[PDB]
Symmetry: C2
Subunit: 222 residues, 2 copies
């Protein structure tokens, strides 16, 4: 007996973070629900929500539309993926700053419509009057990491990319406080169903385990 | 000059980067150009002189192309930590154990591809999984498994990806494998490509893998 099908849009990179354990726990606690997962970019999620193709969208862009509302879940730290022989890797335990990377061969990704993670990264550089001269855009994250592991350059990546460990690939912390990539949950701009509120609580629960501290009024009830 | 090397994406989780890095370090003066592409695309590209060597996973046959089996990589089953099949992690399981499970095939790109490869191995033994879904790529398959719907057959080097509560189980059927080939046109005097062969031979020896002929 399925009480309801809940449909969830998500950006692909979130699979390397908490998304799967959140969905697994949500399913487990709510065996009366059928949950369907649809990979789609943040802009695509907006249209999908409006016409009911999905019920919640987990995205990385803050893109306003009156018919949608969103809540920032957390800011994920960025890191520098480097070859283990790279000078920057001597700072693995201490971290580095964006201005240390301006003369390095940087692999941006993905190849997809902009804005995306690539523009996101370049905007953080531009916010501090930094203009990396050696830039190359590649198809997606694992191509970027493979090329770093091969000796082709370095890449800025979400911290949860560390789910991928390749031989002679290292991840160096980036210390600039604004060196982050957000995670949002977006829903239609109306009162959330009992089912979506249940999803909020699952996120709350996992976040508490991760020791994340809740901001004021974070994920409403009722 | 420079050397153009075609490769299938799944090889990035294996020894490809390590080979390329050792190769680069030995020849800092040479520039290397790595191009992601399928095995059929590599073949046509070799014949047209658009790449120098192609690392692929398909048993192709062309008069123009000299192909060499480097090694067979084992297949594994990606499962949730809680899955019954994960009780045989140390022993391993067989293809026939999987036919009533929800299997995630990938990628969704044009066939023949890894999906066709996996389904062909099942059908080579009269096995026909009824619950199949073809998804876009490997990380989607793994994420969906970890979220608690499905299992997926994957190359063993896929273990580079470790997701929370994702576990990989060995497959025991001897033909549960995916080959790796190096392909070049029927060619001779080229020192850079001979040095690529030797770089592979060096990495394989260090790993303990047996070597191909020369």
């Amino acid at each position: 007996s399925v009480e309801k099908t809940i449909r969830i849009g998500f950006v692909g990179s979130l699979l390397f973070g908490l998304l799967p354990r959140i969905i697994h726990l949500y399913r487990q606690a709510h065996p009366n629900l059928r949950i369907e997962l649809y990979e789609m970019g943040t802009k695509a999620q907006t249209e999908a929500l409006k016409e009911g193709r999905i019920d919640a969208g987990f995205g990385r862009l803050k893109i306003s539309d009156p018919a949608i509302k969103r809540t920032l879940l957390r800011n994920e730290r960025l890191m520098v993926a480097v070859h283990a022989s790279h000078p920057l890797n001597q700072m693995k335990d201490k971290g580095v700053h964006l201005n240390d990377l301006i003369d390095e061969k940087i692999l941006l990704y993905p190849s997809s419509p902009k804005p995306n993670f690539s523009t996101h990264v370049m905007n953080i550089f531009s916010d501090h009057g930094l203009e990396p001269t050696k830039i190359n855009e590649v198809r997606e994250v694992q191509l970027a990491l493979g090329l770093v592991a091969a000796g082709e350059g370095i890449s800025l990546v979400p911290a949860s990319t560390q789910s991928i460990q390749l031989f002679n690939l290292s991840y160096v912390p980036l210390l600039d406080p604004d060196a982050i990539t957000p995670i949002y949950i977006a829903v239609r701009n109306m009162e959330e169903s009992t089912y979506i509120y249940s999803l909020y609580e699952t996120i709350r629960q996992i976040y508490a385990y991760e020791g994340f501290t809740e901001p004021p009024n974070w994920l409403e009830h009722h």
